[PDB]
Subunit: 489 residues, 4 copies
């Protein structure tokens, strides 16, 4: 293995698991085994929780500004170690260094930096009832919470979940994807170095079926925050609910629509469509994988998309000139190729890619070509199902209401966007689209200030923005009676 065996992180330090079992993480660029990683046992989970319990007491006992200064220090360390964390993330995900150096840690730390500044602003309410009585509310920490991470943006997700949790005075136990465990451990180190009390951010590695489930079931954990497929999200939420009525946050899948209206600049529209489909090799939940184009612009639009896709620079993620890397794993590559086959079988016209890239050294990695399908139909498998790979489906429409009805016609509802120059149409259309994340004349930007999450089966709750920080506290109302008490008895 390229690295030494990875251990659990409990109580401000690495500790041995008690499972006697490990798993491997695999560089998707070349098949290389990067490291063996220990599997948390059930008792290791018990251990993490007890550690989390005592750590949270220390963390919550500090002042708001003390917590804020510690989180800001972590932000500083993240900025310093940006390029080094990125390089690790690139080995572990296959994502191009050009992305990991500029997006993953930068935007992960952005959210942490945002919340660090907001600790002192968490406030309750005061309500006068009458001269002899009033109420005040407190926003108290939940206590111990758990985050279960996804494999497309491992460290960013760990940051987006842990930042609000810690800022609100909680301790978090985090479980990275078994697929991408490496950077989460590094984040734990950084928190500890920043001054976060032992136990406040612990990392447990292992599978979702086991340690993931052991966390969602644990009676001492107060909330679960999950990021993954909708199918898994349902199991996780039910488990969290039926075990001990935990609060939950679910960021799940989508099949998000992008509608190009007939007055759009086609150069901008194509730039948006390719970004909404091919960044991180198509492994972004909010991707605009259903692209609606008006009949009158279909030929020009396809030509413009084609031209951009052709010049995509697929290659070794270590090469700074690469802007399109392999997929995250070989099994995931197989999944994508199956969907691609589905599209061919169902008679969608293949415009670009549509197969594995095996030339030379690429055969050793999980490379799928940037693929565009056109002449698609709403009932095709590639159009209904989330592919989570580099697969664009182009759908022609004739009028606005049709485009909107079709965009909305899905059980998903994470993101949606429109391209248009007309003031009234932009707002009108976005107001009718059933998604939590809506973009006008852009795609993919997710400011720390902007609450993001899904409508329908694409999620529950939100991340980022002031509202997310509020939902990592619980409300206690205190009624103070200053006068008499009357009893009917």
């Amino acid at each position: 293995a390229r690295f030494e065996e990875q251990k659990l992180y409990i109580g401000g330090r690495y500790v041995e698991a008690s499972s006697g079992a490990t798993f491997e993480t695999i560089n998707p660029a070349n098949g290389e085994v990067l490291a063996k990683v220990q599997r948390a046992s059930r008792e290791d989970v018990e251990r993490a929780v007890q550690s989390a319990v005592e750590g949270q007491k220390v963390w919550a006992a500090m002042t708001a500004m003390q917590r804020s200064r510690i989180l800001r220090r972590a932000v500083d360390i993240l900025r310093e170690r940006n390029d080094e964390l990125a390089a690790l993330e690139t080995l572990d995900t296959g994502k191009p260094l050009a992305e990991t150096r500029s997006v993953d840690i930068v935007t992960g730390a952005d959210v942490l930096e945002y919340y660090a500044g907001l600790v002192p602003a968490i406030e309750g309410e005061q309500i006068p009832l009458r001269e002899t009585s009033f109420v005040y509310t407190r926003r108290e920490p939940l206590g111990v919470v758990a985050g279960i991470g996804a494999w497309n943006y491992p460290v960013q997700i760990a940051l987006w979940k842990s930042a609000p949790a810690l800022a609100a005075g909680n301790a978090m136990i985090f479980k990275p994807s078994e697929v991408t465990p490496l950077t989460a451990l590094k984040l734990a180190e950084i928190y500890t170095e920043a001054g976060v009390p032992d136990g406040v951010f612990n990392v447990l590695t292992g599978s979702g079926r086991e340690v993931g489930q052991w966390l969602t079931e644990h009676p001492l954990i107060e909330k679960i925050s999950f990021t993954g497929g909708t199918s898994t999200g349902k199991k996780v939420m039910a488990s969290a609910s039926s075990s001990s009525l935990k609060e939950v946050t679910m960021e799940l899948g989508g099949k998000s629509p992008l509608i190009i209206f007939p007055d759009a600049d086609l150069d901008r529209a194509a730039d948006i469509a390719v970004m909404a489909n091919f960044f991180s090799s198509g492994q972004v939940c909010t991707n605009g994988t259903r692209v609606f184009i008006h009949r009158s612009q279909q030929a020009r639009f396809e030509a413009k998309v084609l031209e951009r896709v052709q010049r995509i620079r697929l290659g070794d993620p270590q090469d700074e000139n690469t802007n399109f890397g392999p997929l995250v794993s070989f099994p995931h590559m197989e999944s994508v190729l199956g969907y691609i086959e589905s599209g061919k079988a169902q008679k969608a016209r293949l415009l670009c890619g549509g197969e594995r890239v095996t030339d030379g050294a690429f055969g050793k990695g999980a490379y799928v070509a940037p693929t565009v399908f056109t002449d698609c139909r709403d009932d095709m498998t590639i159009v209904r199902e989330e592919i989570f790979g580099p697969v664009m489906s182009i759908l022609v429409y004739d009028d606005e209401d049709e485009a909107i009805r079709r965009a909305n016609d899905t059980e998903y509802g994470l993101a949606a966007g429109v391209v248009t120059q007309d003031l009234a149409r932009a707002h009108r259309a976005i107001h009718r689209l059933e998604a939590g994340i809506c973009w006008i004349n852009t795609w993919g930007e997710s400011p720390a200030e902007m609450p993001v999450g899904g409508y329908k089966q694409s999620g529950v709750g939100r991340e980022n923005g002031l509202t997310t920080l509020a939902h990592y506290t619980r409300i206690k109302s205190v009624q103070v009676e200053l006068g008499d008490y009357a009893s009917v008895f």
Copy 2:
């Protein structure tokens, strides 16, 4: 039966169920059959959902102030029919006329009145990102929601659930408990009379063994609001989660602690304890059923409690002088007596009552005497488990930290209260008590402005207050890009 057969309420009128089944509702004061009530079929749930979907569109297309005025009109009618509705609730619940006339509809209407005033204040946010881009959020209705009521406060709960839901522009399908179906049907008539559009408040009758489940599982229902026992709640929330990832609010059970500190006025403390245990014959979720008294004061406090309990006026709920009625149902009485038996069996000292009242006309009702146990211990069943009847457990303690530690030692966390004249101790203690509803020197008052709900397994989410209104909307974030768009490809 006293009344005609009760039908379903869908689309602004009564319609015939399609189940071929009915169930009875019984006056618990005398075993009289009040009415046969039709059971919704699964196809009837579907019919109520489609009706709600169409109604919600009409409702949400009105202006905020139009919705506000309509809800304000429903409040006026409720004020007019307070006594008439109270009488009907008394028949159905066995609760004394003295209670239903001054609490149930009054405080139900209080909350509707409160939310009616707030419809025009539901706002989103606007966030500048830079000169060429900003975001704004919309707080959009969820759409169709379901409420599931409990049997202790049927109409009040229907109001507490439907008011925020409708205020926020949703339609609600409501299922009263099969034990108390009558007043919810009246509420539906009233909304229609006030101008609420057809389909916006539909009522489905049945039980948790069917229609309840059909509601929590329906794919087109976006949120479940549930009030009931913790054990049922866990089931409900799991079904709500796994079926279609619904949002949920759960108001569940409690074993709420009332700590009487040594400096307390024992007359007030006694008053608070009796109110916290015997109002609505002990059928209040937030009841203070574990009463901690300091050892130095145990003798004195037990005498003051005894004196009040002795003069409780148990009797026919129809008599205005009655302030303690029978229980809601005979099966519920059996459950309660079971617990009282447990108390005796585990050697707690019976101070008061402890049996069914069967003298004269009472033998035909479900009357359980006001019961007080003392010399209790934390491992007794009557102390760990919610009884939801007239059973107070008095527990001796020695120091402040011990009382609080014990008060907190429960999976429950609905309410908690302290009685004390000391400024510091009142706040110090209340801040350390793990409950969502905290009372200082009083008990049971639940203003429309005060968010209420449980910590731990006593609930998820809140009812009443500003925050609850927000939780009947979903957030959509809109990013408007006014400048250039940059692609890496």
Copy 3:
């Protein structure tokens, strides 16, 4: 006179002034004497303050929902008497019935209705400092506040000032314009009938020089809210400041820019421009009296404006078909005619109107034709100075940045608007315009939810919206120390 002598309104009824003096209010349509009106003396002011102080105590002692219900009852009476009140406002202002029946009372009552609903939502904050200390804030009533009104929307202004004041638990002493005293007194009657305690809304008539100033100087009045000209506002604000440091709201004049961009529909642009100049005979503070048109569209725009202006129905305000009435007074007409003369003398090109209309019955009143000057320049008197009459100035520009720079080149800053179909231009332009009230593709609408007020010399503070309610309370911060106090001594 048409009506009996109008007396002061103090403490829930009419009382004789103690000045020995009166003035007359005149119908501007025909010069008819509507009423003798009493002038409040200095002692009457003192009487109204003492009344207000006592009434405020009763008002604030009520609960939030009690106040809310009384204000709602006032709304109901206003809706009932809309037409009768409009008729009176038309007599007093000369504004067409078609306007007074549908705008003045409707939108005045809209704002009262909005705030009535919000009374229970006024809340302070709670902030934990450490385990042994926290703070909570109270938003307490200011106490007694004064409103000074203007003559163009007399009752609407009285409502827009008294609604938030009373909703926040204050008492208001209101001084309507000497020019238009009649409807303010009716409002005071209506408040009383709705159940507003005696003293809570008192009305003093007289001049600004005397009674207005006595109000702004009185040591027991905590806030002044004024609507009028910028020049007068400076005096009033200085006086409120130096006397006793009162809080202030100032709604003043403007010279608001309307920018029509080259991609605008010119029919919509012309509709907007005429509505923004000729409603209430040009006597609206937020009027868009500087209208910027691109050089390439000048001729077509003028033709469209001219076509609409030609069909304006100047006439007797009592006639329902009239949509353009006389000005409020003969002296105000003289002022407006002076500006019109200035425009001719400085060589602006007269497109429409530009003179008094004296034909037939119009000679009895103060009627100025709707007037349009074009080929204007920035340095012209009519372009620099608020005219407050029916005088539109059309200005030609060549580029967007030029238009915006010129629109901002003024000491005023009340309103601004753009007409454009382009998404990016609409927001970009509005964001750069230095005014508090900004309209895109519309003009003049002022929803109860929307904070309105001026930038620069056009105002201080705001009216309407959530923010305004807050500004009629004062913040008290309360720190509770629960632990030890330390002294350096």
Copy 4:
């Protein structure tokens, strides 16, 4: 002089004034000249305003987080240089090193640190009106604002005013008291070093009569924030109003009541009373200078206060062991000595101090002994008028309501405090006290989170907290019309 001649700070550097005039700043501990300081001319004000206009544009064009980082860096520098800055403040004010090292910069930086974290959280609102129209508000910077400082807490005031101003994206021109100009200039250096753009924080030195007034009058300055005496505040506010209608914040004087109730611990009470009267040698605006003691406790309270005052360590502010320094200036000492004479003359009983301390080296400084008057009456000059020196007035009362009535019997209303162990009394009394800053069982703590300012003639607006940040912005409302526009013409 001890230091070189101090110049103006404009555009991120020192520049020569153009008045040709200087003034001296004097160490009050020994009468020695610390520095000659330049007087800004009228043209220097203009220069500073132009500098600020251009600076503000650079500042506002950065992103929220960029501003946040810059201010956080300033905080870091201020922490590094705490002792050095404290030493300069001690020279300039005469305040003990023990105070300045732990209070002045510490709490100045706290507030800056607080606001730096809140920059990204400044948001507007979004309000839907109907399907075809919505509004959003923007909270835009005011632009250029001016702060005018007092002499008791020079650098802390400069920080409390500049922090929210800059955090909200404004440029501030600041004018320190002529009495204490030194630390403000240092602050400007630190802001520049931290990366604040040139012009964003400019410092002009001179007299309030001249430069101060030139700032309140300048047409381009949008807001004045002032701290000082009520009498001066009125003139400043009048000038800011009549010149260009500026927005204002005024933090003025007071005669704040401290009410010791009979159940209070007299040791704590005495500790609080002395701290509320003798910290910073009595030069604290919020000082509890009227101390109310129940008659039954007068003798004992006097004893306890006497014992504490006698051990007060008056001496050289350079001595770490000194905790009571000289007054800020010789003319100020003279004023205080006058008030003390008045006290003696009006027959209040002198319990302590009551004269200048001239022993040894003290005769070269402006030392007044800690002074306690008892047997005071409400009509005594020392009880009615703010002394702003080390003079406590003890007042006896017989009942709660009398004490509260007398506490409120003043045109002032800055602070108030009660001492009591009773829950009800604590909150009940404080809710009835007419002051903006209320303390229970403590005094003097002013956390960044807590809004502080005066009722009545003690102030306008507030500083710190979340509310203050809002008030360094102006609200712009934007209505977007997406549908048709209707004209009556």
